[PDB]
Design a protein around this ligand. Structure first.
Ligand SMILES: C[C@H](OP(=O)(O)OC[C@@H](O)[C@@H](O)[C@@H](O)Cn1c2nc(=O)[nH]c(=O)c-2cc2ccc(O)cc21)C(=O)N[C@@H](CCC(=O)N[C@@H](CCC(=O)O)C(=O)O)C(=O)O
Length: 140
């Protein structure tokens, strides 16, 4: 698409609409649901808000840290590593979670859930040179 913003400017615009509307607008991407993760900034201490694909199961969520399978980690990856207490907004509702990087069978199961929501995640694997981080968020 020739007449679209950069992916970074799109993410900024989406998170702005999402937050300013109290989760009543801007909550989808290609028809698929998006959440807003709030993390504590590792360096600055500021609260940082990031739109991510919604992957949910019985009140837990998972988030995938991957810029299209590229190896450089998103900055919010570092915020979670430093501070596991995060907030997650799903539409009009928000809550507190403990985020942890998962491994093994747990990671495989959540990855399958994520690929059902956002099939492109499977394609990203073909570009990888580092593990793809997956976090599971449990209510707290
Ligand atoms: C460009 C950078 O963003 P980032 O945290 O590297 O994240 C890159 C992307 O993951 C981010 O744009 C995502 O929202 C993109 N994104 C997804 N990204 C994903 O990785 N996974 C997804 O499933 C996903 C879905 C998605 C859906 C909609 C959408 O609009 C965007 C989506 C950024 O926002 N810069 C900030 C960083 C803010 C920050 O947290 N800084 C820390 C720095 C700490 C340190 O560097 O150690 C601080 O304040 O101290 C800034 O500096 O102003």
């Amino acid at each position: 698409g020739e007449y679209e913003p950069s992916p970074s400017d799109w993410a900024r615009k989406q998170v702005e609409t999402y937050e300013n509307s109290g989760g009543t607008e801007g909550t989808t991407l290609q028809g698929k649901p998006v959440v807003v993760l709030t993390t504590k900034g590792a360096k600055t201490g500021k609260l940082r808000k990031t739109p991510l694909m919604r992957v949910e199961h019985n009140g837990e969520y998972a988030v995938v840290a991957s810029l299209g399978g590229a190896p450089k980690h998103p900055v919010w990856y570092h915020n979670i590593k430093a501070e596991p207490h995060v907030e997650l907004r799903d539409g009009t509702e928000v809550g507190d979670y403990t985020a942890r990087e998962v491994t093994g069978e747990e990671k495989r199961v959540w990855w399958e859930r994520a690929v059902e929501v956002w099939p492109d995640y499977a394609e990203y694997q073909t570009k990888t040179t580092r593990e793809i981080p997956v976090f599971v968020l449990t209510p707290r």
